[PDB]
Amino acid sequence: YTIHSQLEHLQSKYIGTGHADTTKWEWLVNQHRDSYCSYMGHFDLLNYFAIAENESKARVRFNLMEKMLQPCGPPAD
Amino acid sequence: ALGALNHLGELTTSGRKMAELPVDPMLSKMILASEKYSCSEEILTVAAMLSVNNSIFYRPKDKVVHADNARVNFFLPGGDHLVLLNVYTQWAESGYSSQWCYENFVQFRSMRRARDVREQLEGLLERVEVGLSSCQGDYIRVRKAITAGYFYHTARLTRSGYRTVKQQQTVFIHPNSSLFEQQPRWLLYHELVLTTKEFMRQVLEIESSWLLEVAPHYYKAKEL
Amino acid sequence: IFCRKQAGVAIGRLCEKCDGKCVICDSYVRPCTLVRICDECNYGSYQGRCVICGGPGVSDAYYCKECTIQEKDRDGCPKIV
Amino acid sequence: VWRNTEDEILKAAVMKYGKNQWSRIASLLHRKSAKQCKARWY
Amino acid sequence: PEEQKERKIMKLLLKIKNGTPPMRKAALRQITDKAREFGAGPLFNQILPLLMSPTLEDQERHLLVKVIDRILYKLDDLVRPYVHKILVVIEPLLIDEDYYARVEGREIISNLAKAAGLATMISTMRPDIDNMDEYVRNTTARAFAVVASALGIPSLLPFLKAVCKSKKSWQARHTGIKIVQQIAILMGCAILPHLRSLVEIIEHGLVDEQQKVRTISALAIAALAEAATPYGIESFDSVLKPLWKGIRQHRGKGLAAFLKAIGYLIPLMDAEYANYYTREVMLILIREFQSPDEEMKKIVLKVVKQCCGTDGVEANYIKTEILPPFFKHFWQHRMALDRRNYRQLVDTTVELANKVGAAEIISRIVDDLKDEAEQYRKMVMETIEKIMGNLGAADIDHKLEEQLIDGILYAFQEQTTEDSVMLNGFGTVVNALGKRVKPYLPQICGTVLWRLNNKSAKVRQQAADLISRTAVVMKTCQEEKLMGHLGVVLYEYLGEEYPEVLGSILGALKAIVNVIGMHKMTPPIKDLLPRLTPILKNRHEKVQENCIDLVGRIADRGAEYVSAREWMRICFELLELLKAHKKAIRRATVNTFGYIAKAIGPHDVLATLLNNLKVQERQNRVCTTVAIAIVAETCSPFTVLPALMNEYRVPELNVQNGVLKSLSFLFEYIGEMGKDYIYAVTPLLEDALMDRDLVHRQTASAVVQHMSLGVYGFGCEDSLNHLLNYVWPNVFETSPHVIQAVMGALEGLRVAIGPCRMLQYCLQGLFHPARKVRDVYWKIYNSIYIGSQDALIAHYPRIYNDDKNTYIRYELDYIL
Amino acid sequence: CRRIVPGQFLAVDPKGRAVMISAIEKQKLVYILNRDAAARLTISSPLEAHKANTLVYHVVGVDVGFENPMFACLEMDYEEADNDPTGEAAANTQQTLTFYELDLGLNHVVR
Amino acid sequence: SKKKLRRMNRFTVAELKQLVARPDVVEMHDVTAQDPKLLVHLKATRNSVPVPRHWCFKRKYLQGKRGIEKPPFELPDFIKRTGIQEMREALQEKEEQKTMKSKMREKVRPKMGKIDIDYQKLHDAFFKWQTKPKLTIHGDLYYEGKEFETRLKEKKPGDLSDELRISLGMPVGPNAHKVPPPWLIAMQRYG
Amino acid sequence: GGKTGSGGVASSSESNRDRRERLRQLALETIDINKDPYFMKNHLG
RNA sequence: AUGAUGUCAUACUUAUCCUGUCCCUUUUUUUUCCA
Ligand SMILES: [Mg+2]
Ligand SMILES: [Zn+2]
Ligand SMILES: [Zn+2]
Ligand SMILES: [Zn+2]
């Protein structure tokens, strides 16, 4: 259970993990944020979207980082 | 915490009575606890022992084994305090015999001054309003009055050694404890020193339940 | 129990009892990369000690090639304090 | 002392070998000697 | 009353003290927003007595200083009227032998004076610099250092000018001077933006009448030098002269600290100053070379180390000037008798050696190898060893080297303690004499041999050691008669029965055979090793360690001056070294099984290993299973895999588990060349993953782990898929070892098979009714997520969007 | 290309004294650079600025004159907007142009 | 009681099966799950792999395999071929007959190189005749008794066995084609 | 008087292994002389 | 048809241990009808 002190330290360590009660909302929103961080990181899906819509890389990443805030609806209750 | 002070720091009836009483409160709280537990005489004689203990048993090198033996004779189940109780009991039983302690490897000085401190304690006992009672062989009352006095002076088992109840600082048992190999789960002591390693003296095995009996305001259950 | 307060540039070392094994994987083979520890488990009387034994720092704690394939060596000072 | 398992291993050994070959029966038993074997049986 | 209520609701410090980390979040957030309204008026009086309560613990302190710092950030203004109170109640903590009391008082005072109302500080703590008590002056002075950390010196420097130019009190001039030295201790490099402003502050008191202020200002010079490394007297020249004159026109405590400061500036100095200043101070030094005093000795010798260790103290200078009185009065028994003097006298004397060579220092401390207090000659070899080990022995001339070698022999005989002191001394000294040692090898050995003859074990053992040291140079001077001697004579002593000597003899023989190879050894190993085999039965850790070392060397490299039958007997003896109580022995044993498999073929040694697997008691079964792995690694695994697999059919437990554990180690050891035997081994692991026992499945899982990490990247993913099918059911398990080896198998299998496959195995049980299954799947998915969280972005399912949320990812299905 | 491991943004100090590495959430470090005696560059252990629940739209070094170097990041705080079941805190949240600062003397990064 | 009101949210198995788009999945305890719409969409995704059987059970994993008797492991062909097994059988019988005294006598005077088996026999097994075993593709977890379950869902008529042919009166082998079984006779007779 | 041409004396591990094996034969003998149809020796011994 | 309960010995696991341990200085507190 000191293992648990370390393990909810691990929950505090890695944003996106889970535990047996985790809610569909936390799960899917964390995966959605991660999806955004990687669309930004990988230099080429950025071209994919930039080219799919008719936007430009500054436009693209600005949208993405705005969306990063409430990507999957408002919260659960 | 012991109950000599109100929540603002002045004197309770319990609190005054102990200051007039000769010796310190922890002991004093235990003596008052004899009032509740009807172990008057036994708690009295225990007090008389802890007054002077530090020199009870002579432990010469040139007679180590016979000495350890005239000691190991009295070793009672429950702890060092009731050990002392029976030891004094048997000495006075012998009629305050000096050769008794000489045969049984006990410092006559310690014994007889302790007897004197108990007798003058009894001479205080009327003022501190104590009824002269026996536990009738019920050492449970004895250990419980010991708790009602020395709840603060407690440790618990940890798998990394014996460690305090409160501060969880790490102690060890004195080698010469009547429980030194017994190594109980719920421990009471009387000394707190750190010789070559942290130590505690005149120790006894307790119930953590008596702790919620006595000090639910100081000792809460979740911490046991 | 682990320190895990994050990594640094200070190498770790092994007593001679502990000589040879990896820090976690407990291997004896094919060590690839050197170990690094934190300043806090770097200072003072803890300079040059055995991450495992606590003995004197003489031989260099290393990282079993499996541990580097799975990058369990990118967490920092794993000192069992 | 003596435990159900050993007592039955004894029983079996004796009933096979006979009641005067105490040294081999002792050899079957781990930490038991022929004095104790003979006493236990008799 | 609202004030008592606000405190009532304020004691959710219980919410933060006890409770969940959920509790911590609720209360921490609510108060971090309620901080202004709830105010520090009531807080501080509730707050100080807990922070001072005797046993508030590490993290209680951590959390409460979290509180004080963030609530003081919050309430830059709403903490105002409690400043002197916080100040004086926490003050002793920065000057306190608890580094973390220093740290935490430091940090919270940083934030306190930081968001504080500023003038307040000055206002409160002006009149205390003039105070009468050096106690309070030191406390407030090191406070002022902390307050300069909190704010910055500039805002303060003129008020420092005041507290240091005061003509009312010397108390206050001393106070300002120690404020100076204190910041000079604390901020360190951060002073060069001023670098002389403080020097100005201090120019007033090195001439002062109170020795207290004078000499603490000397130490201020010291501290400023320290934080003010080699950048020299472009700031400090403004005070160099009072130091200079007081050094001589003074006596005592001033001599101490003023010498300390001047020696701290002696690095920063330059020739036309660091020639005149040093040359002048040297005559002070010569009168102080007889100083009885301890911290005197420390300061003067440290001084000398830097001072007569510059480029402007001539070789000639020191050799004619410092050395005679230095050697005279410090090379008395007293200093080696001392606990401090031993090592520090070492320090500076090794440095003077570094300065001026060996052909005089060595000569000045030769015959201290024959003094009385064995501690003394112990010290002199401690030094000499350090010295020649760092420097080399180039200039040591003839007669010098003679008296040295001879004092060496003496020290080593005279030895009366079990110490590596004289050993290492000897090793180093001949290590540096190199080839200079030719003509005394009769002498050196004859000594060692007569010792080898002694009655008491200890000296015998010592002489064996010393042989093991000088073993290499023994040869390198071409000791035909003499190294031949040591060879055959040790072959003689191989009959000892004092384990403590027998072990050292084996060590010395090993350290001879290292230099002289096998095929010119003086006892041919053809007779050595036959003699060694009956020793392997000596049931003692030290002799066993050294014997198995020697036999391992021989079986590695010699190996052909012996017969197959000899190697077989030695195999049978190794089989019961696997029960020694020391692990070095057991690892050496396994290595030599490897070497013997190389020399002789593998098949007979493998047959003798399986029969050992039949034993019980686990730690020699496990070490034979290591040995099997090792034999297979050296002589290619196809030679041994059929025999292992076939032995997997003997119906006994310990042996089926021995086979499985051995394959575990084998796949670990070979690694990327498992892409061959993965197919051969699968149907045996699937066999043992369909139950046979707990340990059966624990071990087959370990094997899967190591196979996966070996076959990473070679395409054998169908086989690891097949074995996933069999490992994954054990996921619900309880025994720690079993479930743990299972989890390990799944991390290995995660890199080797990819994280899609394993996210699919982990999909359906994330949101299961139960809680045992929910918890195991979230444990796995956590470990799958931590490592390789970034692949998964292309592996997540498609999870439809209900009414008031959006859940599909349209980003990913733009067409293009 | 993770989310909380640094590397997406990286800035320097205009003079060439320190670098900061930064992620798009929860992590940024700083490295100090000194010529060695032979002027062959060295790099000591890194600093820390772990602050939870915070985006970063950029990080950049501010040009100070031989003071402590310091950096201007943007920021945001998705925290509340995920505590509010109404979507109010989605709106009404403000970028916070902020500066962290070195302290090369005391060797830490202060907000 | 709040768990009990969510328990009134704890819908019917018919509630589920009618709601859901893929009704094959819906099982018993599905409903006591905090998010059954998810749980069922997941369990109806492609390629995903369902929880083992045995989380319900009170018996642990293969304590049900406890009872039976089991035959020892059967080597791969290409390893039998190289004739190791007979070497090992022979050595076994030798050393089970030999007595303790002779055992130690052979410890002190070994029968060095009693046997031999040549390389290129091994190296050709492992490098020239090694072959793909039978593997099971993604998803098919092994559960207790699975190897006992015979096999099903071959509704095909042409599926015949050789023991089937023998104990039905028809031919085995290349004549399993040109042999119409005794059931094709009444297929021709009445359909 | 011993004899020449002999090994040593069995070490306690081998003595233990064969004590075990002899015990097992003792068991097989008794279950033979008592004719038990309710017995099995499993593939793990 | 496998429950927990156990003071059950045996079997078994971690290349898990054989090297992480020990005895107090000094000394002090007022008292109550006798029968
Ligand atoms: Mg004869
Ligand atoms: Zn490791
Ligand atoms: Zn650390
Ligand atoms: Zn170690």
UniProtKB/Swiss-Prot annotation, chain B:
Compartments it resides in: Nucleus; Nucleus, Nucleoplasm; Cytoplasm
Annotated tissue distribution: Expressed in the spleen, thyroid and testis. Also expressed in the brain and cerebellum.
Top-level taxon: Eukaryota
Disease: Neuromuscular oculoauditory syndrome: An autosomal dominant neuromuscular disorder characterized by variable features including myopathy, neuropathy, hypotonia, joint contractures, growth delay, chorioretinal lacunae, sensorineuronal deafness, agenesis of the corpus callosum, and seizures.
Family: Belongs to the DEAD box helicase family. DEAH subfamily. DDX16/PRP8 sub-subfamily.
Function: Required for pre-mRNA splicing as a component of the spliceosome. Contributes to pre-mRNA splicing after spliceosome formation and prior to the first transesterification reaction. As a component of the minor spliceosome, involved in the splicing of U12-type introns in pre-mRNAs. Also plays a role in innate antiviral response by acting as a pattern recognition receptor sensing splicing signals in viral RNA.
Subunit text: Component of pre-catalytic spliceosome complexes. Component of the minor spliceosome, which splices U12-type introns. Interacts with GPKOW. Interacts with TRIM6. Interacts with RIGI.
Name of the molecule in the record: Pre-mRNA-splicing factor ATP-dependent RNA helicase DHX16
Organism: Homo sapiens
Gene field: DHX16
From-to range in the entire protein, with total length: 798 to 1021 of 1041
UniProtKB/Swiss-Prot annotation, chain C:
Example of a GO MF term: zinc ion binding
UniProt-annotated site: Interaction with SF3B3, residues: 9
Species in which this protein is naturally found: Homo sapiens (Human)
Protein name, as recorded: PHD finger-like domain-containing protein 5A
Full-protein residues shown: 9 to 89 of 110
Chief subcellular location: nucleus
Positions contributing to Zn(2+) 3 binding: 22, 25, 64, 67
Gene: PHF5A
Lineage start: Eukaryota, Metazoa, Chordata, Craniata, Vertebrata
GO BP term, pick one: stem cell differentiation
Region called Interaction with SF3B1 and SF3B3, residue ranges: 27-43
Curated annotation (Swiss-Prot), chain E:
Region (Interaction with PHF5A): 59-62, 668-669
Signal sequence residues: none
Residue spans of the HEAT repeats: 41-80, 81-115, 116-153, 155-189, 192-230, 275-313, 355-393, 522-560, 564-602, 634-672, 675-713
Interaction with SF3B14, as annotated region: 41-80
Location (main, coarse): nucleus
Modified residues (N6-acetyllysine): 66, 74
Region described as Interaction with SF3B3 and SF3B5: spans on this chain: 760-816
Site (Interaction with SF3B3): 114, 189, 717
Reported function: Component of the 17S U2 SnRNP complex of the spliceosome, a large ribonucleoprotein complex that removes introns from transcribed pre-mRNAs. The 17S U2 SnRNP complex (1) directly participates in early spliceosome assembly and (2) mediates recognition of the intron branch site during pre-mRNA splicing by promoting the selection of the pre-mRNA branch-site adenosine, the nucleophile for the first step of splicing.
Protein name: Splicing factor 3B subunit 1
Source lineage: Eukaryota, Metazoa, Chordata, Craniata, Vertebrata
Residues shown, of full length: 489 to 1304 of 1304
From Swiss-Prot, chain F:
Signal sequence segment: none
Domain of life assignment: Eukaryota
Region entry Interaction with SF3B1 and SF3B5, spans: 82-111
Region (Interaction with PHF5A, SF3B1 and SF3B5): 34-57
Subcellular location: Nucleus
Modified residues (Phosphoserine): 45
Family: Belongs to the RSE1 family.
Function: Component of the 17S U2 SnRNP complex of the spliceosome, a large ribonucleoprotein complex that removes introns from transcribed pre-mRNAs. The 17S U2 SnRNP complex (1) directly participates in early spliceosome assembly and (2) mediates recognition of the intron branch site during pre-mRNA splicing by promoting the selection of the pre-mRNA branch-site adenosine, the nucleophile for the first step of splicing.
Domain comment (free text): The core of the protein consists of three beta-propeller domains.
Summary of subunit composition and partner proteins: Component of the 17S U2 SnRNP complex, a ribonucleoprotein complex that contains small nuclear RNA (snRNA) U2 and a number of specific proteins. Part of the SF3B subcomplex of the 17S U2 SnRNP complex. SF3B associates with the splicing subcomplex SF3A and a 12S RNA unit to form the U2 small nuclear ribonucleoproteins complex (U2 snRNP). Within the SF3B subcomplex, interacts directly with SF3B1 (via HEAT domain), SF3B5 and PHF5A. Identified in the spliceosome A complex; remains associated with the spliceosome throughout the splicing process. Component of the spliceosome B complex.
Name of the protein this chain belongs to: Splicing factor 3B subunit 3
Organism name: Homo sapiens
